[PDB]
Amino acid sequence: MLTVDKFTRAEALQRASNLYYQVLGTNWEDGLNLVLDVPFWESELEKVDHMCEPYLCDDEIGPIIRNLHETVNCMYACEDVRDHINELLELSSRAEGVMGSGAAASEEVENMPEQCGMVTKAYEDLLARYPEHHPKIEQTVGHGLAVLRQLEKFNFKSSHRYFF
Amino acid sequence: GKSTIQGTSYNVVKFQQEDVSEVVKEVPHFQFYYIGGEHKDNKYRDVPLDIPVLTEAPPPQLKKPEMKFSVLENGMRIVSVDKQGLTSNLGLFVHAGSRFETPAEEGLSHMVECVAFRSTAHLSHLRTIKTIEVLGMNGGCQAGREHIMYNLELLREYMPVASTLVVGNVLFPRLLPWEVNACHKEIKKAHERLKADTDQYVSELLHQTAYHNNTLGNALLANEGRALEHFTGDNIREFMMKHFSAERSVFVGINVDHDELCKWLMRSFAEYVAIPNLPRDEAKPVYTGGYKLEENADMPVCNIAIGFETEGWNSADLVPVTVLQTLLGGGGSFSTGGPGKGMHSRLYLNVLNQNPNVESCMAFNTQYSDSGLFGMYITGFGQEAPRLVDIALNELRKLDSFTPDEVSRAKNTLKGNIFMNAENSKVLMEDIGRQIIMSGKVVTPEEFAARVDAVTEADLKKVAAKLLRKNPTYVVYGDTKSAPHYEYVRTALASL
Amino acid sequence: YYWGSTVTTEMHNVSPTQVTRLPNGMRVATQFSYTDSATVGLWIDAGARYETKESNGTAHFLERVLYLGTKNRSRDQLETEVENLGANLNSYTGREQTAFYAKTTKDGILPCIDILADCILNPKLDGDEIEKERVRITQDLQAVNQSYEELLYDKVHTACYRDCSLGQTVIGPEENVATIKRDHMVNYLYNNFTADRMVLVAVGPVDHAQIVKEAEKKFANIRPTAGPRMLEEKPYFCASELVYRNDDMGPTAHIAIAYEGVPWRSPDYITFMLMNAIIGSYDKKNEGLVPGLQSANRITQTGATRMDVGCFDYYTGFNIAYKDTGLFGFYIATDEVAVEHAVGDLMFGVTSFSYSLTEEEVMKAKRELKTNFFSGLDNTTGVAEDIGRQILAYGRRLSPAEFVERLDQIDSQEVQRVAWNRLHDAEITMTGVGPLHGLLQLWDLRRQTWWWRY
Amino acid sequence: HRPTTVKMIDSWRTEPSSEKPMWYNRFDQVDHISQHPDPEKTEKYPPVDDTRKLM
Amino acid sequence: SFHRAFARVVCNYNKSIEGSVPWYQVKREKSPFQQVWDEVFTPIWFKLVKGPYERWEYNALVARYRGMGIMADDAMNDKDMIVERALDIIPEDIRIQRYRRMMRGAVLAGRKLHLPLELQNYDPMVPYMAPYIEEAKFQMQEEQELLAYHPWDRRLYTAGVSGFGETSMHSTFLTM
Amino acid sequence: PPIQKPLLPSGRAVLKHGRSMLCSGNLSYDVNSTIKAPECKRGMGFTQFKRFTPVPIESGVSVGNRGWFFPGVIPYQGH
Amino acid sequence: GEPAIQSIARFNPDNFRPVGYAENIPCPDTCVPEGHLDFRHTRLPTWHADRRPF
Numbered sequence A: 001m002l003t004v005d006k007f008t009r010a011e012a013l014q015r016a017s018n019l020y021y022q023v024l025g026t027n028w029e030d031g032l033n034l035v036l037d038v039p040f041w042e043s044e045l046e047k048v049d050h051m052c053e054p055y056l057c058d059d060e061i062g063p064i065i066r067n068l069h070e071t072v073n074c075m076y077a078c079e080d081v082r083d084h085i086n087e088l089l090e091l092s093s094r095a096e097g098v099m100g101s102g103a104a105a106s107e108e109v110e111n112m113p114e115q116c117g118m119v120t121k122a123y124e125d126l127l128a129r130y131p132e133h134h135p136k137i138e139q140t141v142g143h144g145l146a147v148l149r150q151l152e153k154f155n156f157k158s159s160h161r162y163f164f
Numbered sequence B: 001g002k003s004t005i006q007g008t009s010y011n012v013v014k015f016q017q018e019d020v021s022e023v024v025k026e027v028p029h030f031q032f033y034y035i036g037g038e039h040k041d042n043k044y045r046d047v048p049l050d051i052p053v054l055t056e057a058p059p060p061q062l063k064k065p066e067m068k069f070s071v072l073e074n075g076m077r078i079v080s081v082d083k084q085g086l087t088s089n090l091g092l093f094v095h096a097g098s099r100f101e102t103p104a105e106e107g108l109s110h111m112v113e114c115v116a117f118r119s120t121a122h123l124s125h126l127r128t129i130k131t132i133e134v135l136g137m138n139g140g141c142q143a144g145r146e147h148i149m150y151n152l153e154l155l156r157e158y159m160p161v162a163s164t165l166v167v168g169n170v171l172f173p174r175l176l177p178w179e180v181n182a183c184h185k186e187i188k189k190a191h192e193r194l195k196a197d198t199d200q201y202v203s204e205l206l207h208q209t210a211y212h213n214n215t216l217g218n219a220l221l222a223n224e225g226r227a228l229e230h231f232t233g234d235n236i237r238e239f240m241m242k243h244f245s246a247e248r249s250v251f252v253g254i255n256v257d258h259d260e261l262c263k264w265l266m267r268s269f270a271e272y273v274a275i276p277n278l279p280r281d282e283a284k285p286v287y288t289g290g291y292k293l294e295e296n297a298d299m300p301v302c303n304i305a306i307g308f309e310t311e312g313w314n315s316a317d318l319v320p321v322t323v324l325q326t327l328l329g330g331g332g333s334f335s336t337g338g339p340g341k342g343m344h345s346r347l348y349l350n351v352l353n354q355n356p357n358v359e360s361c362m363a364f365n366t367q368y369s370d371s372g373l374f375g376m377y378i379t380g381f382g383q384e385a386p387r388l389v390d391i392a393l394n395e396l397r398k399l400d401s402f403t404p405d406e407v408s409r410a411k412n413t414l415k416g417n418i419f420m421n422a423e424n425s426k427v428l429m430e431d432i433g434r435q436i437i438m439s440g441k442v443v444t445p446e447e448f449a450a451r452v453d454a455v456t457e458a459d460l461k462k463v464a465a466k467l468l469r470k471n472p473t474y475v476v477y478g479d480t481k482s483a484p485h486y487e488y489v490r491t492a493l494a495s496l
Numbered sequence C: 001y002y003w004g005s006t007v008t009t010e011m012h013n014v015s016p017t018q019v020t021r022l023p024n025g026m027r028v029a030t031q032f033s034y035t036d037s038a039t040v041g042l043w044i045d046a047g048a049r050y051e052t053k054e055s056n057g058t059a060h061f062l063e064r065v066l067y068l069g070t071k072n073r074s075r076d077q078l079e080t081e082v083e084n085l086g087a088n089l090n091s092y093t094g095r096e097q098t099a100f101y102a103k104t105t106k107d108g109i110l111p112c113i114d115i116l117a118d119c120i121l122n123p124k125l126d127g128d129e130i131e132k133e134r135v136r137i138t139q140d141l142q143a144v145n146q147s148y149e150e151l152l153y154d155k156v157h158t159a160c161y162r163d164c165s166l167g168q169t170v171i172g173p174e175e176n177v178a179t180i181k182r183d184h185m186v187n188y189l190y191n192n193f194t195a196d197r198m199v200l201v202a203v204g205p206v207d208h209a210q211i212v213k214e215a216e217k218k219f220a221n222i223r224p225t226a227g228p229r230m231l232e233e234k235p236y237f238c239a240s241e242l243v244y245r246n247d248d249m250g251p252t253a254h255i256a257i258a259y260e261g262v263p264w265r266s267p268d269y270i271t272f273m274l275m276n277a278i279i280g281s282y283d284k285k286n287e288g289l290v291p292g293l294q295s296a297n298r299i300t301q302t303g304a305t306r307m308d309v310g311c312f313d314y315y316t317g318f319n320i321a322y323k324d325t326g327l328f329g330f331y332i333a334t335d336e337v338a339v340e341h342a343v344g345d346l347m348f349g350v351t352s353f354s355y356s357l358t359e360e361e362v363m364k365a366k367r368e369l370k371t372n373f374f375s376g377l378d379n380t381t382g383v384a385e386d387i388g389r390q391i392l393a394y395g396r397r398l399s400p401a402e403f404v405e406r407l408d409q410i411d412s413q414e415v416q417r418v419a420w421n422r423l424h425d426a427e428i429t430m431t432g433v434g435p436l437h438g439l440l441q442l443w444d445l446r447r448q449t450w451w452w453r454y
Numbered sequence D: 001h002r003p004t005t006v007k008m009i010d011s012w013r014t015e016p017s018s019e020k021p022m023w024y025n026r027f028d029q030v031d032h033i034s035q036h037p038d039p040e041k042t043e044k045y046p047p048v049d050d051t052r053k054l055m
Numbered sequence E: 001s002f003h004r005a006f007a008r009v010v011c012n013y014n015k016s017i018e019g020s021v022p023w024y025q026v027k028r029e030k031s032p033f034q035q036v037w038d039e040v041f042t043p044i045w046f047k048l049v050k051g052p053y054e055r056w057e058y059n060a061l062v063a064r065y066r067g068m069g070i071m072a073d074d075a076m077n078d079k080d081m082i083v084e085r086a087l088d089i090i091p092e093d094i095r096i097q098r099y100r101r102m103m104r105g106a107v108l109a110g111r112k113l114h115l116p117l118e119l120q121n122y123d124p125m126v127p128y129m130a131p132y133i134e135e136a137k138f139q140m141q142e143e144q145e146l147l148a149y150h151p152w153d154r155r156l157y158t159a160g161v162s163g164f165g166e167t168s169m170h171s172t173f174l175t176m
Numbered sequence F: 001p002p003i004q005k006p007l008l009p010s011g012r013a014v015l016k017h018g019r020s021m022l023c024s025g026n027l028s029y030d031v032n033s034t035i036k037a038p039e040c041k042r043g044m045g046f047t048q049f050k051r052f053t054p055v056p057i058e059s060g061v062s063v064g065n066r067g068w069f070f071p072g073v074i075p076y077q078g079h
Numbered sequence G: 001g002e003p004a005i006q007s008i009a010r011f012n013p014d015n016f017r018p019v020g021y022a023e024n025i026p027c028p029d030t031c032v033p034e035g036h037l038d039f040r041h042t043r044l045p046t047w048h049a050d051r052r053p054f
């Protein structure tokens, strides 16, 4: 990164830890939270990586960096899958028509079960890929599947744990 | 096996006529110009190296390497081994070294090396060397006493290009007058390189003295005086027509698929005629012994070598004499070797540990097709020369008997050296090419290990006795003002 | 610009490196190869950096005396046993890493593990051996007995890292060498040679399970761990000059110029490897197939033309990485009167990375970087060094395929971004030996890191 | 050499020499340069007395 | 960034014309309009203007060469780089006579004399330099392509050379 | 990953004249070997600076001659 | 059927000379053809007077 600022390791540790908890504590389910904050996270994350570069082997800063990077990886992955689910739900809503009356109802999704099969497969991949972020995955993608399950009857492993 | 050549069976590769359009599809893809491009940010710019980034790697396919032998219809033999490494080592060996020169042809073998990778029928000098450079390949040519080698080291995906460039040196080189005249510079550089390596320079003095003015005594390097008269494209072409032929050439490839290597080599000779094979005068070396005292005013140290003739690589004494070299071993003060690095060889125990004035003592052993040299090389300060020779002579008189422990240690160290030297690919390439040129056969490292285990003390005594009956060759280099005379050495060894 | 992927099917056809952590914390890494010879050793995280100022030089002393007898064996018995196996015990000690390995035949793999374990765990640091080695080390310590490349390598660290232990030399100061005793070495063994810092690397016709079983048996009594290393700030790079002006050592002058580099695990490390390859190396006495006047390397080509004679008798780039810092620069050996042209040309070349680097030069450099790296992995000892050094540096071994994948992403634009951020208008350190009237002040050379043009 | 330039380009209107030689394209080829005739020892054309009789 | 878009356009275009046959190597038939022009203008123009003018100039040139006793290829100036590179490689026997002819010509021209008519019966348009001019052009084209395909950056006004490309020291006014 | 070889490849034959893989000793530590591991008298690391070309440096030897001068002739102002 | 090395050797540029080179190219023996004035005609008689004073 192009910068002339200098930070001590104590300052670098504080910045990295603050960003790590800011991302993990944020509610990823609300789309607007990621839209508004991600631009701020990226700017900070660029600074944190630059100042923490000499401490990637440090016994304290090192683990924080690995968790921070892993959390950002999971945030983008969960957002992408849940973003697709939102599109499917929005398509279903518009197919209802005006006032849910069908007055100007649009064309329905003809391959809804296929989409449900595709989304659930992606959901399983997240769980295997990010074993330490299940609470966040269930918050965004797991809850999204439950909403879809109301529209269409499909089977996924955790369906019974969502009262289905 | 479809053809047996000089004791080895090869698979015959048939020439095939292929349209140039079809082959062009198979040439490796590369560019010299990058006129524009599609911009793409480094996706791993924020990923530390400790985090793996590659996923879904195909499972590896491991095969035990095996040496395979093939031959073209023009008579060029192809030997390759695929160790599944990522860098190839292509080598072209031609049975035309300095030993085949007549006195009027002095230095022509070295001249051929100097004009290597110059203009060919289908490529310019500049285009050849820029292609080698852009593709990240290294290599060169080296002319020896019995063979001349062209070698390239490259990423294996570019093998089709490299094989073509090497072959062009012997298929259709344009020995243009002005290009050849630009190679006169290399003669002075070659002398400087040789004289810098004191061990090699003394080795050349040995061979010139050991074989007086005949095959193995011909100077390796051309002189820069009267030899330049025939340093001409026409003279070089006449020399190549005498000796360079597909029947005397072997192509060696390490870490290359054999079928691909054979296919591309076949396509290179498909529509062209190689130099025809003609009989040549092949005379056995004449060993005379003798001595030479070469002063080097700058050096204060004295390098002494005493050598004896050996029957050579094709004899049954190859392994016993090699075991004798490891038993005596040697070493030097310069280095401080740890365990297993010759600290208990006979020369190290009997010379270096007991004579603080000895700077270094070693046993050398050069092997060629039908002759070789074995002896001791000892160095020290100039004024010490009379004592250095006495030490060397005393060791030569102790080769009458060997203890069982020494024989076993020598055999085990030799086997370790064989296996450890083999794992180097450039070494394996040069070993295979030299063996086929010398003998027409390849003895694998494991087969040499079996021979080493069969060497007994009786064999060592017999081989040593034969060596000591030859007229010694006595070379002194550096500060020679105190060395003993040749007759002193001969009388000392006359008793044996 | 992106020109495609250079990964091939052959890159995937390599035996996997299996790494397991023993209960004590020692990592055991092995790769099978179809060879009749093997290399087994212990790559330990230790070195001069982790020594204190008073004890500097103990690690080097220990390395030299470790193989000179053990409690169970003797120097003659140990040397005899290794020779009977047809093997050779080797070792080295650096600022941050140390290794004790044996090149052996197939039958000697397990016997060599025993010998190496005995030397590391039960060293018999006899006083007589120590005193003889003190004489040898003292002679080695003399500058007259060191090469000029070795001197400059140490002086680059002394000048660049004045505030931290990386500035210490491995051999140590003569005052410490004079005073080191068995107790110093015994303490260093206890504190630094612990299981958590050791990796047992076996390359050859080896089975991972068998090596692991032998390792657990022979290294059972090793100290499991030592206290965590002190937490320290980023090593401060001091822009300084340390020049030994000697007009009584002949015509050649030796100069080394350094920039602050990057640590091993930096995302930019591979970019710095490529920049090191672009700088390349040249020798007037080994020009290669392409002459300097027609070289693709821009630094080499412009240099060869200077004054119709050439201003570089020898030069090489260097890229040195440590856990939290690195050094990037070039080393020159050139005629006295040529030094101003030589340093000016090699600095103009590094500054060009920030402004005008062609795709052609990058792509050539990628191929010659890959050739150097892959050819180094040809023999077992080359593989073993790679496994051990990488696991210590990264905690894992990067595959050839992964290295190529990451290198594919790096292009002229990426080199330009990294150079603009880190090397453009950057601070430099200059070090030298020999006749250096032509060498200018540090500030004058530090102004060549940026251009008025563009 | 001093700053210098050659017109080594790909014209849009003029063909290269390989395509259309501008010289009289009849040469004699030998195997070695020594096989060429020697002009000094070679008889030239018979001298003329009138400028209108020149070849 | 617009430069990135421009770079992609250049790359795609050039990739789409690789291996194109040069205009001169195409078998081209004249259009029905150029054929008419060649049928009418060209014959009359050759008969009345081009033919006579160019014969008049050519015959004068042959006479000038014969008066100096030189060949046409002698007249080439070695300030042209192709000529200089060709002259490096010409064989000695050709070189000796070329020098002698050129020296005689300058003496004749300087003293305002002409070669005796006894020595003028030769064809001055024999192309003896052609093999070497073609070799020199090949050598120069290889160097142009493999070594001069980009405007290179070098340190300026150092070692007697401007750094803008020339290779001889003190060969410009600003390098005195 | 670490680089274990100099940036300038040797390009020469590893084996010396007349010496084979069998009779060359151990190329890992033999004095005459061209690929022997250097001894770390002062420690590991300096091989990154080291010049592996065995020929000693000849200061000021010309490599920038394009054929414009004969050996021993001193150019004057480049001409 | 010629060895490629021999075939490419013939096409050396030194092996091509224009038809009629030996019968046309002038071979001057002097830069002063017969009939032209030179020092042998302008030398003054040996009995001449000193020309330095004038």
Ligand SMILES: CCCCCCCCCCCCCCCCCC(=O)OC[C@H](COP(=O)([O-])OCC(O)COP(=O)([O-])OC[C@@H](COC(=O)CCCCCCCCCCCCCCCCC)OC(=O)CCCCCCCCCCCCCCCCC)OC(=O)CCCCCCCCCCCCCCCCC
Binding pocket: D009, D010, D011, D012, D013, D014
């Ligand atoms: C309301 C009004 C508004 C007006 C707005 C006007 C805006 C104008 C914007 C202009 C912007 C600037 C342009 C500058 C370009 C610079 C290019 C350059 O330097 O390139 C060097 C570059 C160097 O290349 P190189 O590789 O180093 O060398 C190439 C080799 O030499 C060999 O290359 P090769 O073998 O591949 O050949 C390529 C070929 C390619 O050639 C072409 O394609 C060019 C063709 C040009 C044809 C022009 C014909 C004009 C005819 C007008 C007819 C009017 C009819 C009216 C009818 C009325 C009916 C009622 O070239 C040739 O054959 C030779 C070219 C010779 C060029 C000579 C240059 C002279 C310039 C000055 C001339 C005028 C001054 C005297 C008169 C002034 C007073 C009147 O040259 C080239 O590549 C060739 C380019 C040649 C360009 C010439 C253009 C001339 C245009 C004249 C316009 C006249 C207008 C008249 C109007 C009349 C109306 C009634």
Ligand SMILES: CCCCCCCCCCCCCCCCCC(=O)OC[C@H](COP(=O)([O-])OCC(O)COP(=O)([O-])OC[C@@H](COC(=O)CCCCCCCCCCCCCCCCC)OC(=O)CCCCCCCCCCCCCCCCC)OC(=O)CCCCCCCCCCCCCCCCC
Binding pocket: E001, E002, E003, E004
């Ligand atoms: C025929 C087929 C069809 C044809 C279709 C043609 C298609 C093209 C036309 C359409 C073009 C659309 C352009 C879209 C632009 C997008 C804009 C945008 O979103 O921004 C992203 C865009 C790119 O962002 P990025 O992705 O980060 O890339 C950065 C690079 O700039 C990226 O650039 P680069 O790296 O690629 O480098 C090239 C760079 C730079 O390229 C150049 O500058 C080309 C230079 C070539 C040499 C020119 C020599 C001079 C020639 C003069 C000729 C005069 C002839 C007159 C003839 C008269 C008689 C007829 O180009 C640009 O910066 C793009 C320019 C975009 C348009 C805005 C500027 C246009 C010129 C306006 C001039 C107005 C003059 C008024 C005069 C009034 C007189 C009274 O932002 C910019 O950089 C654009 C602005 C550039 C600076 C313009 C000047 C700004 C002035 C601000 C004044 C502030 C005053 C404050 C006062 C405060 C007092 C308290």
Ligand SMILES: CCCCCCCCCCCCCCCCCC(=O)OC[C@H](COP(=O)([O-])OCC(O)COP(=O)([O-])OC[C@@H](COC(=O)CCCCCCCCCCCCCCCCC)OC(=O)CCCCCCCCCCCCCCCCC)OC(=O)CCCCCCCCCCCCCCCCC
Binding pocket: C453, C454, D004, D005, E148, E150, E151, E152, E153, E154, E163, E164, E165
């Ligand atoms: C209605 C309103 C309208 C408004 C419109 C507004 C329009 C605004 C227009 C703005 C100006 C546009 C000018 C465009 C020109 C394009 C020419 C072209 O096609 O060039 C291709 C051409 C390439 O030709 P080539 O045949 O392919 O290869 C060339 C070589 O043979 C072999 O090439 P090579 O690549 O193999 O050789 C390597 C070497 C080749 O190097 C060269 O070619 C350099 C040649 C020597 C340059 C130095 C000459 C000596 C000094 C002359 C000045 C003396 C007095 C100065 C002080 C006076 C104080 C009272 O290349 C390099 O070194 C690459 C990097 C070069 C840049 C280095 C930067 C540091 C030095 C700074 C000076 C150079 C800056 C770039 C050029 C600027 C052009 C204007 O390149 C050049 O022309 C090179 C530049 C030479 C001209 C420099 C002129 C400087 C300004 C003088 C005052 C002018 C006043 C007159 C009016 C000005 C306005 C028009």
Ligand SMILES: CCCCCCCCCCCCCCCCCC(=O)OC[C@H](COP(=O)([O-])OCC(O)COP(=O)([O-])OC[C@@H](COC(=O)CCCCCCCCCCCCCCCCC)OC(=O)CCCCCCCCCCCCCCCCC)OC(=O)CCCCCCCCCCCCCCCCC
Binding pocket: D003, E162, E164, E171, E172, E173, E174, E175
């Ligand atoms: C429709 C409207 C049209 C309008 C038309 C007008 C258009 C406007 C533009 C006109 C001007 C164009 C300028 C072109 C610049 C070219 C730059 C360049 O490439 O230079 C290198 C280039 C050499 O090429 P190269 O060899 O390839 O370069 C490689 C080497 O590195 C090169 O290096 P090199 O060393 O070999 O060559 C360098 C060369 C470059 O120089 C030149 O060749 C001359 C260039 C500049 C020309 C003069 C410009 C004058 C205009 C500005 C002044 C206007 C004042 C107005 C005031 C009004 C007030 C009311 O020589 C020098 O540098 C000599 C420097 C000598 C300085 C001596 C100073 C005195 C001693 C020191 C100080 C005093 C002592 C200390 C005292 C202390 C007291 C205590 O130069 C040339 O070859 C060209 C020279 C110029 C030829 C004529 C150009 C004609 C332009 C066409 C239009 C003409 C229209 C008709 C005009 C009629 C007027 C009455």
Ligand SMILES: CCCCCCCCCCCCCCCCCC(=O)OC[C@H](COP(=O)([O-])OCC[N+](C)(C)C)OC(=O)CCCCCCCCCCCCCCCCC
Binding pocket: C447, C448, C449, C450, C451, C452, C453, E155, E156
């Ligand atoms: C309406 C029509 C408008 C037409 C506009 C036309 C404008 C034409 C303007 C021409 C200006 C030319 C400037 C060239 C500068 C020198 C060449 C150069 O860049 O050299 C690179 C070279 C090469 O640099 P380098 O990049 O190799 O640097 C290597 C390392 N260092 C930086 C340490 C040298 O620079 C030099 O070596 C020269 C010294 C620096 C010169 C800096 C600029 C001088 C500015 C003068 C001050 C007074 C200005 C007053 C103006 C007032 C406003 C009117």
Ligand SMILES: CCCCCCCCCCCCCCCCCC(=O)OC[C@H](COP(=O)([O-])OCC[N+](C)(C)C)OC(=O)CCCCCCCCCCCCCCCCC
Binding pocket: D009, D010, D011, D012
């Ligand atoms: C109803 C009647 C309709 C008539 C239509 C008009 C027809 C006229 C066509 C001829 C003139 C225009 C094309 C000239 C081509 C040669 C120039 C060229 O290629 O340059 C070489 C070089 C390009 O070289 P290069 O780098 O491509 O290399 C090619 C090199 N050779 C030729 C050797 C193969 O040009 C340049 O360097 C840049 C030129 C920039 C653009 C210049 C201006 C172009 C014209 C703009 C319009 C102005 C006139 C009209 C305005 C209104 C008038 C009232």
Ligand SMILES: COC1=C(OC)C(=O)C(C/C=C(\C)CC/C=C(\C)CC/C=C(\C)CC/C=C(\C)CC/C=C(\C)CC/C=C(\C)CC/C=C(\C)CCC=C(C)C)=C(C)C1=O
Binding pocket: A097, A098, A099, A100, A103
């Ligand atoms: C789609 O379902 C819905 C949601 O999702 C469930 C919502 O969340 C929400 C909550 C959202 C909000 C509060 C956001 C703000 C919403 C607003 C402002 C309302 C948006 C909805 C609308 C404006 C309704 C869309 C427009 C219409 C239905 C048109 C209304 C006019 C109508 C029906 C008149 C047309 C009548 C005809 C064409 C008949 C013509 C008669 C003849 C020709 C007879 C002629 C006779 C003779 C004699 C000649 C709503 C309101 C919703 O409807």
